Amino acid sequence: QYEDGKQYTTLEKPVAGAPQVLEFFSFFCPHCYQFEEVLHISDNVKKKLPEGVKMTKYHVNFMGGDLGKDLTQAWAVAMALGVEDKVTVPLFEGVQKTQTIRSASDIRDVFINAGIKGEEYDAAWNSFVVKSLVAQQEKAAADVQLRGVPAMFVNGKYQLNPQGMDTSNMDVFVQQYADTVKYLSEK
Amino acid sequence: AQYEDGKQYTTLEKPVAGAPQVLEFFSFFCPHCYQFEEVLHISDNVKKKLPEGVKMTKYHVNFMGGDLGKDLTQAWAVAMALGVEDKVTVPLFEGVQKTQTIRSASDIRDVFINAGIKGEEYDAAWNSFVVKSLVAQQEKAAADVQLRGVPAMFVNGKYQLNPQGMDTSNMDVFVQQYADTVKYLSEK
Numbered sequence: 001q002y003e004d005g006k007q008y009t010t011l012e013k014p015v016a017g018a019p020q021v022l023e024f025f026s027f028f029c030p031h032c033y034q035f036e037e038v039l040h041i042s043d044n045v046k047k048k049l050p051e052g053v054k055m056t057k058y059h060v061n062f063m064g065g066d067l068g069k070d071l072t073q074a075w076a077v078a079m080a081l082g083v084e085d086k087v088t089v090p091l092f093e094g095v096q097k098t099q100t101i102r103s104a105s106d107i108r109d110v111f112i113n114a115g116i117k118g119e120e121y122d123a124a125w126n127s128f129v130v131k132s133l134v135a136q137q138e139k140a141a142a143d144v145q146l147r148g149v150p151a152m153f154v155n156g157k158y159q160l161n162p163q164g165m166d167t168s169n170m171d172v173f174v175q176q177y178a179d180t181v182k183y184l185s186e187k
Numbered sequence: 188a189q190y191e192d193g194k195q196y197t198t199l200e201k202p203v204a205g206a207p208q209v210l211e212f213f214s215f216f217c218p219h220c221y222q223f224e225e226v227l228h229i230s231d232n233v234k235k236k237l238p239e240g241v242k243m244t245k246y247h248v249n250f251m252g253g254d255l256g257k258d259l260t261q262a263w264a265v266a267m268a269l270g271v272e273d274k275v276t277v278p279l280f281e282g283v284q285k286t287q288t289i290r291s292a293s294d295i296r297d298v299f300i301n302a303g304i305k306g307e308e309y310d311a312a313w314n315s316f317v318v319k320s321l322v323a324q325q326e327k328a329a330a331d332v333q334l335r336g337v338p339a340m341f342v343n344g345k346y347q348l349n350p351q352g353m354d355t356s357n358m359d360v361f362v363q364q365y366a367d368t369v370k371y372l373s374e375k
């Protein structure tokens with residue numbers, strides 16, 4: 001029983017050439033921590049979607065002050081090096097659980113400890129490839145008039161509405177969320 | 188340590204009458220709350236340094252958890268009603284955050300049963316007026332201190348701990364600084 005306003009909302013001005021599935025998060029975002037560590041939303045959405053569908057995940061600037069911008073640049077590094085899955089957990093825990101991530105250096109340490117060579121990290125950090133990925137993340141958020149995280153957009157036309165879903169059972173919530181993404185992608 | 192308003196603690200503009208002597212707020216969904224309790228043992232270390240007669244109170248809140256969050260607050264009310272907080276705190280934190288075995292109210296109940304509380308006793312407590320009242324008490328206390336987030340601790344409804352705020356460069360030092368601050372405030 002899908003209804004606009006319930007499981008999802010519809011953007012007023014759809015974004016052209018938008019990614020099929022686009023997620024925004026912040027490492028400072030508490031629901032984003034839950035979505036990644038506890039619920040594994042991205043993994044479960046991926047499992048429910050066809051192989052052909054591309055999922056994109058971008059970091060945002062508007063949580064966490066100066067460190068917030070640094071983390072967006074760090075996420076650009078992770079995308080450029082293809083090590084998202086190596087650093088997502090220690091970045092989330094470093095920010096929200098242990099609160100040991102306080103500076104860019106602390107972010108660098110996380111990449112080092114996750115097996116990324118220091119020289120490779122620094123080269124990426126300062127690269128124009130990464131500068132462009134930072135620009136891409138910012139523009140994407142601006143295109144959908146992003147006001148908060150977590151957020152997921154389907155074909156630049158629909159936005160998921162987790163608030164409209166059932167939150168008594170974690171796996172029911174995940175099922176309803178993932179099923180909504182599939183429904184919207186086939187729309 | 189040299190204590191100053193605004194440093195190790197802040198002072199509520201609207202103090203709360205009849206508040207518990209030492210009141211801690213947490214959520215089982217809250218990862219820094221997991222850090223506080225399961226890793227740092229803040230509650231326990233504060234209690235060790237508390238003066239004789241001063242009891243600790245700990246309430247559950249629901250900023251992140253939706254309906255399941257409400258179930259957790261009611262289950263925490265049951266833990267308080269039964270006096271089994273020290274038996275279920277660990278498996279609730281680990282079950283929600285680490286093993287991800289706690290996904291519904293039924294899984295919460297299973298934790299109490301595995302910790303030695305009979306199912307019929309858990310259910311009796313769950314549906315009791317005592318637990319209904321305790322749920323309301325936890326909410327009201329959070330409202331009274333204008334709670335913004337967790338973890339948080341309040342002393343005599345007048346002072347709010349400010350860990351920000353403290354030497355969080357060494358976890359052992361942080362814990363003693365935090366516990367010493369609670370002792371100081373309780374003595375004022």
Ligand SMILES: Cc1nc(-c2ccc(C(F)(F)F)cc2)sc1C(=O)N[C@@H](Cc1ccc(O)cc1)C(=O)O
Binds near residue numbers: 173
């Ligand atoms: C993004 C988000 N995700 C949530 C969620 C997801 C899963 C689960 C479960 F445990 F079941 F897995 C619980 C909550 S609330 C939530 C969220 O946006 N929460 C709001 C408050 C709110 C909560 C429930 C409503 O029906 C309406 C408003 C806030 O934090 O201010």
Ligand code: NA
Binds near residue numbers: 338348349350
């Ligand atoms: Na605190």
